[PDB]
């Protein structure tokens, strides 16, 4: 039973996913709008005095297959080393965008070591922001042109993660069975295609 639900950020009452609203996403398959993961959502918002989210409640998103707008992850549980709760996300549409043109934005997650967007096949519009993820690997080889269905140029803001040479040296590279399109993480179930 496909179930569409409203998201956060722009055009929405909710500015971030938080404990107050996380359970509204139970069994959603399609997000009408955006998902935002702000620091206040994950650790607690003093001005509304909203509690810190329960990290195991992020498993609600395993039902998400489509995000109409953008994905904006700026805080993540320190012991969750990838975004495997979005293993079933296939399409980011970017009908609505975040900041200066982004549909995907992964920022300053000191503890994420791979992305894990295993099902991700299409980002229909927008620019890609992946920066300051000091531990992030496996994204270096990834063929964004496949996912963006267009020229990669003027669409990437991918900086300041773990240095490629450092990833290569520690064996944090794509499995040999994966295409030259790359991986979302270690091993053969993580190949882009």
């Amino acid at each position, epitope marked *: 039973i496909p179930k569409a639900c409203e998201g956060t*950020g*722009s*055009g*929405s009452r909710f*500015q971030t996913v938080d404990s107050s609203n996380i359970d509204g996403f139970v069994n959603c398959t399609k997000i009408l709008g955006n998902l*935002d993961f*702000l620091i206040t959502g994950l650790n607690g918002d003093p*001005w509304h005095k909203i509690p810190a989210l329960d990290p195991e409640k992020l498993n609600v998103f395993r039902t998400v297959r489509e995000i109409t707008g953008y994905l*904006n992850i*700026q805080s993540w549980p320190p012991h969750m080393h990838n975004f495997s709760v979005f293993s079933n996300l296939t399409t980011i549409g*970017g*009908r*609505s*965008l*975040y*900041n*200066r*043109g982004f549909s995907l*934005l992964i*920022m300053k997650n000191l503890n994420v070591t791979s992305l894990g967007f295993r099902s991700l096949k299409e980002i229909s*519009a*927008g620019r890609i*922001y992946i*920066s300051a993820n000091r531990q992030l690997c496996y994204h270096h080889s990834l063929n964004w042109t496949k996912v963006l269905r267009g020229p990669t140029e*003027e669409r990437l*803001d991918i*900086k*300041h993660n773990r240095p490629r040479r450092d990833c290569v040296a520690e064996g944090k590279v794509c499995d040999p069975l994966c295409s030259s399109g790359g991986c979302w993480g270690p091993g053969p179930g993580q190949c882009l295609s």
Partner: antibody, heavy 121, light 110 residues
Framework: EVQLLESGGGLVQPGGSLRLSCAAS????????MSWVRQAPGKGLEWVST????????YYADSVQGRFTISRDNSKNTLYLQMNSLRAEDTAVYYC??????????????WGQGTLVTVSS | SVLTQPPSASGTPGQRVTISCSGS????????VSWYQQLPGTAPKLLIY???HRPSGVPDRFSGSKSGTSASLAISGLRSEDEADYYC???????????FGGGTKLTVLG
């Protein structure tokens, strides 16, 4: 409390050059994308340029492209606009603007009082 | 910088005024709208960002909404002190730059 002070405006001859300065205080300068927005006397707002927190992405308006250079010095809490090949229609108050990098609240969550640039023979 | 706004809007104290802002898919159809208040002689201040959210310190009589490529700013409970120029703004994917509206002069009567 936050504060943006612009400076360096004045009268200058067409084809001439000036350098505007924005001195920042009351926030971590390094966390903020800085921008320049201008306003001709009695006319609307016109975005000029944006640089990001680390000088990693830089954006310009078609109207100034190839004549103005934005820059920043995080260690000095100072934004810069090097303006070359000035045209009379660049006459404007130049505002300095700030917004947290990839924050939700923006763009231009705070503006200074502006410096006035007059371009005339 | 071609976002279409009404040049002028008016109201009496305690009214609700709306200011519209028309754009394109590449600007406010995709990216978010922000709105600014500029009182005469003074620097603009952000009013509304990401289509409908208000900075803390911005009263909730100001509200923003968007659908397609048209955005609306609302000022309920109009005040003398709200007499000002209002600018909408949007990032434009096509331009890699910000695009402002012309401005609307809001006058408070009564």
């Amino acid at each position: 409390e936050v504060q943006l002070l612009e400076s360096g405006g004045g009268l200058v001859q067409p084809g001439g050059s000036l350098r505007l300065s924005c001195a920042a205080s009351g926030f971590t300068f390094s966390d903020y994308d800085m921008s320049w927005v201008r306003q001709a006397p009695g006319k609307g707002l016109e975005w000029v340029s944006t640089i990001d927190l680390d000088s990693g992405s830089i954006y310009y308006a078609d109207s100034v492209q190839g004549r103005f250079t934005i820059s920043r010095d995080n260690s000095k809490n100072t934004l810069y606009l090097q303006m070359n090949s000035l045209r009379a229609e660049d006459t404007a108050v130049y505002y300095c603007a700030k917004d947290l990098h990839m924050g939700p609240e923006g763009p231009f969550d705070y503006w200074g009082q502006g410096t006035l640039v007059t371009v005339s023979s | 910088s071609v976002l279409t706004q009404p040049p002028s809007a008016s109201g009496t104290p305690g009214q609700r005024v709306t200011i519209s802002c028309s754009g394109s898919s590449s600007n406010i159809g995709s990216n978010s709208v922000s709105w600014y208040q500029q009182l005469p002689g003074t620097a603009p201040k952000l009013l509304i960002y990401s289509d409908n959210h208000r900075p803390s310190g911005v009263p909730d009589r100001f509200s923003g909404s968007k659908s397609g490529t048209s955005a609306s700013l609302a000022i309920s409970g109009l005040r003398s002190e709200d007499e000002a120029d209002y600018y909408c703004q949007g990032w434009d994917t096509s331009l890699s730059g910000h695009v402002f509206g012309g401005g609307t002069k809001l006058t408070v009567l009564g």
